[PDB]
């Protein structure tokens, strides 16, 4: 399947591209410059991504947001940890 | 009906939560902690998602991500800046 092998490969590469920022607050205990803002609102939007996913019946864009949101959170959680 | 309207309106919300980081870098000149690594690869990634939804088709898919690339790219320019 063309669509889906697409949609897999998108979805690989924008959730693990969450992977690098959470590293680097983590490996230096920071996170000043990071918009707490973006991912605030990025984790909603993500969340209503996920509904729409499963509306249309697309399992790349269900499994991609699910895992983005767990990812995301961490993210916040170390903003606010760092604080 | 009800899917374009739950993607349009997480299409809204998820391109433009990419506006306060280049705003917060450009406001403080500085984006030390910012990782470039993580928005080289969502640019990448992005643009896949923009494949995808022409193949499948979907409108929402489509305009989301085209949007969010150009930001992706403001946000990098302003890294590289500060
Ligand atoms: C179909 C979708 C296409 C429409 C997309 C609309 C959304 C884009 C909104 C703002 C970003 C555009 C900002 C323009 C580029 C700003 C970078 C800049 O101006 O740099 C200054 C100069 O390079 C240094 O002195």
Redesign the interface.
């Known amino acids: 399947d063309?669509?889906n092998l697409?949609?897999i490969?998108?979805?690989?590469?924008?959730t693990?591209?969450?992977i690098?920022?959470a590293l680097?607050?983590y490996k230096?205990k920071?996170?000043?410059?990071?918009?707490l803002?973006?991912?605030?609102?990025?984790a909603?939007?993500?969340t209503?991504?996920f509904?729409?996913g499963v509306?249309?019946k697309?399992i790349?864009?269900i499994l991609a947001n699910l895992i983005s949101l767990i990812l995301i959170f961490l993210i916040i959680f170390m903003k606010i940890r760092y604080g």
Not at 9 to 14: D, F
């Open positions: 063309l669509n697409i949609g490969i998108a979805g690989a590469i924008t693990s591209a969450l690098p920022q680097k607050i230096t920071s996170a000043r410059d990071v918009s803002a973006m991912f605030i609102f990025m909603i939007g993500i209503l991504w509904f729409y509306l249309i697309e790349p864009v």
